[PDB]
Design a protein around this ligand. Structure first.
Ligand SMILES: *[C@@H]1O[C@H](CO)[C@@H](O)[C@H](O)[C@H]1NC(C)=O
Ligand SMILES: *[C@@H]1O[C@H](CO)[C@@H](O)[C@H](O)[C@H]1NC(C)=O
Ligand SMILES: [Cl-]
Ligand SMILES: [Cl-]
Ligand SMILES: [Cl-]
Ligand SMILES: [Cl-]
Ligand SMILES: [Cl-]
Lengths: 230, 95
């Protein structure tokens, strides 16, 4: 997985992600965009697989966007059997619940940071106002790290793949550095959904495991776009 | 348009055990069944399948009823065990 949240020079927030999954020639046929309806209105939009009730990707229009990336320190399944049985939430169920209920980017960040989880994860959240982008590195009990955008100091994008951002990416699976270089070469002044989509189309950010690419912007919810790959 | 996934409406005002069925009606159950078996096959190590009954137990008691109610309606629609529905919905929490 790769998730990117970024701010252009005028303060607009953009959010994109690739969902990678091994042995996924089948999941491509089961990928679907879902509009979740409340009171005859589109409450939030996500992308999922048929039969999967949580969301790894979605937007609350005019409020925030969310994507999750898998985080593995080993023994996931073992630790998730242990973690389930105490009222903790599945990763993608929390995303869906947050899209449904949270009133603001601020509120979503707190919920995604603090709600106990059955597994570790990275949550990437974008809002509608300047600086409203964050990578939340989650332990099961709470946040290991909160990493917001800081354009004031020249840090106008955050890239997350599947590794802790304060550690180097492993040389055998370094999709982070090519994404950073591609964003660097795009420039803050040329960031938009189209150029973000292109960054997410670069090998190995886009690779043989990539099921779909989504780009989205809470401030422009009608531009939500998922492209099934391969 | 081209290359985008199908678009579905899912109503949260419809009951949890009904709100996914319209979407499911667009897919061949045999196809979905084999897809579920695949994912469970190459994502759920066999030691996990051994205690899968345990996993069903905790979810029903410790996971929110819509989650479980939605999943059981999918399993009954596709002739899957509840265990398989929960497993495939927990198969993604990591690699
Ligand atoms: C979803 O439902 C809303 C309101 O009920 C409607 O505006 C829209 O046309 C529906 N979309 C689809 C794809 O069915
Ligand atoms: C990206 O650009 C910044 C300066 O804008 C530089 O400090 C950094 O090393 C660059 N990163 C890569 C991976 O090229
Ligand atoms: Cl919900
Ligand atoms: Cl990373
Ligand atoms: Cl790491
Ligand atoms: Cl744009
Ligand atoms: Cl089908």
């Amino acid at each position: 997985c790769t998730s990117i949240v970024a701010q252009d020079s005028q303060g607009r927030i953009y959010h994109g992600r690739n969902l990678d999954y091994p042995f996924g020639k089948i999941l491509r046929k089961l990928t679907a965009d879902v509009q979740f309806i409340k009171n005859g209105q589109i409450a939030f939009t996500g992308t999922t697989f048929v039969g999967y009730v949580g969301l790894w990707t979605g937007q609350s229009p005019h409020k925030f966007t969310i994507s999750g990336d898998e985080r593995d320190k080993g023994w996931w399944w073992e630790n998730m059997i242990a973690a389930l049985s105490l009222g903790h939430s599945p990763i993608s169920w929390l995303i869906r619940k947050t899209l449904s209920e949270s009133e603001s980017f601020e509120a979503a960040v707190y919920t995604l940071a603090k709600t106990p989880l059955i597994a570790d994860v990275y949550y990437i959240v974008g809002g509608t106002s300047p600086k409203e982008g964050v990578v939340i590195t989650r332990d099961r009990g709470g946040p290991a790290d909160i990493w917001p955008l800081d354009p004031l100091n020249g840090e106008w994008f955050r890239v997350e793949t599947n590794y802790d951002h304060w550690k180097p990416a492993p040389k055998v699976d370094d999709r982070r550095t090519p994404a950073i270089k591609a964003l660097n070469a795009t420039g803050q002044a040329h960031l938009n959904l189209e150029t973000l989509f292109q960054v997410l189309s670069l090998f190995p950010v886009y690779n043989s495991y990539t099921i779909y690419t989504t780009v989205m912007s809470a401030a422009e919810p009608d531009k939500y776009l998922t492209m099934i790959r391969n | 348009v081209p290359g985008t996934p199908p678009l579905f409406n899912v109503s949260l005002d419809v009951a949890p055990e009904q709100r996914w069925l319209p979407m499911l009606r667009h897919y061949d159950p045999d196809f979905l069944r084999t897809a579920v078996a695949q994912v469970i096959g190459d994502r759920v190590p066999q030691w996990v399948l051994g205690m899968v009954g345990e996993i069903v137990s905790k979810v029903e008691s410790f996971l929110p009823q819509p989650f479980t109610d939605e999943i059981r309606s999918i399993c009954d629609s596709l002739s899957l065990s509840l265990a398989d529905g929960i497993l495939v919905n927990l198969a993604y929490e990591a690699s």
